[PDB]
């Protein structure tokens with residue numbers, strides 16, 4: 001009766017230990033969600049096996065085939081019992097799996113190369129010298145496409161037509177583009193990743209301004225799962241004990257490479 | 262039948278309209294949670310009656326009688342169908358009712374009278390000239406009592422023995438104490454209330470420093486309610502539509518008095 005946990009290789013949530021081939025089972029992995037999985041299992045009284053999602057994806061429903069991919073797909077098609085990963089709580093996912101209460105907060109944020117004269121989305125929207133963009137697919141692009149807020153609508157009208165294209169295929173390319181564009185590119189991405197990169201060498205990026213929306217990561221279990229209630233309560237217990245803040249500090253700042261300000 | 266909504270008179274969530282005595286039913290009330298109730302009702306397809314919780318409390322279990330008071334009590338004992346209020350998501354409440362996903366974020370924050378040389382909890386912890394405290398019961402006090410974080414442990418060690426007492430019986434008293442202590446008291450309270458008061462005349466308070474923890478308000482229904490799932494999805498839809506942010510800006514900043 002070992003619980004099958006699906007998760008995803010994304011730093012600092014789940015990472016392969018360099019000597020993983022000499023280790024076995026859950027010991028092959030380390031990270032924020034590795035620690036969280038252990039805490040959840042302890043407070044719910046189950047043993048578990050960590051597995052990495054087969055297709056490396058989070059969870060989206062292909063509009064044509066109507067098939068779920070990623071960790072959500074592994075839940076609804078019965079390949080895993082629970083997903084413990086940086087999986088954003090969204091309406092479409094909530095329809096098909098049960099999300100625990102959030103274990104981490106996040107929102108759209110701005111990444112600049114140190115020295116860029118930008119403090120806010122409003123700053124971005126009122127100037128043209130500094131290009132800015134998003135991942136070419138996903139929720140951040142759609143946030144701007146759909147927004148009725150004047151500043152964000154102005155940003156969307158700019159980004160949708162900017163040339164050369166301000167959209168990037170991957171988060172890594174957005175980050176690289178900030179680092180290599182000599183201050184002439186700002187990247188819009190989730191605050192959690194932005195904060196993580198701010199603590200990575202070469203320590204040349206910064207998160208600026210407040211978050212543009214409010215989201216969270218949640219643990220996912222299939223509907224009717226015998227684990228759902230206990231996991232949900234475990235998340236709240238961990239927060240009230242300060243352990244979620246403790247874990248984020250550990251993996252973002254204690255293990256950071258750029259010191260303080 | 263008509264859905265019975267229990268809520269609480271707390272500005273700006275639910276307030277009596279100025280002319281409420283001329284009005285009946287749901288029209289007597291205005292505020293963030295009045296607007297949220299209408300949106301939830303619309304997206305879940307029910308009609309509803311707003312009611313103010315009889316005992317004026319949020320929801321706690323008496324350790325001796327084991328009886329739940331407040332809005333949580335009204336749900337578990339069958340007096341109301343749903344609570345739409347600034348009800349903090351907590352473990353012990355989640356054990357007895359169903360919380361929707363959070364519809365507003367909040368965390369512990371610091372309120373000062375403008376001019377007080379305090380910018381952070383760390384600032385508070387290093388001195389005693391400016392007294393500081395919390396509500397005398399509830400989660401903010403317990404956050405400090407239980408913290409193993411050095412700065413917060415230092416603050417607790419001060420607050421627990423400070424004389425005269427730095428604890429207050431009500432949130433209103435904490436706010437009033439800030440305003441009336443001539444710059445010598447700072448109050449630890451939820452960021453949402455701190456932000457609200459900062460936008461109210463006489464515009465003499467300020468929110469300073471980052472939040473000390475991360476919580477949220479949730480809508481509550483009794484376990485097994487036919488409304489739970491629909492309400493939960495409705496909160497996420499409203500968030501993804503930007504409507505929760507729009508409503509907060511409406512009631513905190515558009516209707517603010519301090520520029």
Ligand SMILES: O=S1(=O)NCN(C2CC2)c2cc(CCc3ccc4c(c3)N(C3CC3)CNS4(=O)=O)ccc21
Pocket residue numbers: 089090101102103104105106214215216217235236239244350351362363364365366367475476477478496497500505
């Ligand atoms: O997509 S949501 O579910 N819906 C919409 N919103 C917006 C407010 C409207 C949010 C906002 C957040 C951040 C604030 C928040 C709320 C509740 C809790 C939090 C953190 N924690 C903390 C560890 C992070 C623990 N458990 S908890 O008590 O439930 C997360 C998820 C969502």
Ligand SMILES: [Cl-]
Pocket residue numbers: 009010011
């Ligand atoms: Cl990675």
Ligand SMILES: [Cl-]
Pocket residue numbers: 022023024025027028
């Ligand atoms: Cl091993």
Ligand SMILES: [Cl-]
Pocket residue numbers: 126127128129130
């Ligand atoms: Cl310019």
Ligand SMILES: [Cl-]
Pocket residue numbers: 148149150151
């Ligand atoms: Cl606007």
Ligand SMILES: [Cl-]
Pocket residue numbers: 285286
């Ligand atoms: Cl009436």
Ligand SMILES: [Cl-]
Pocket residue numbers: 409410411412
């Ligand atoms: Cl510490």
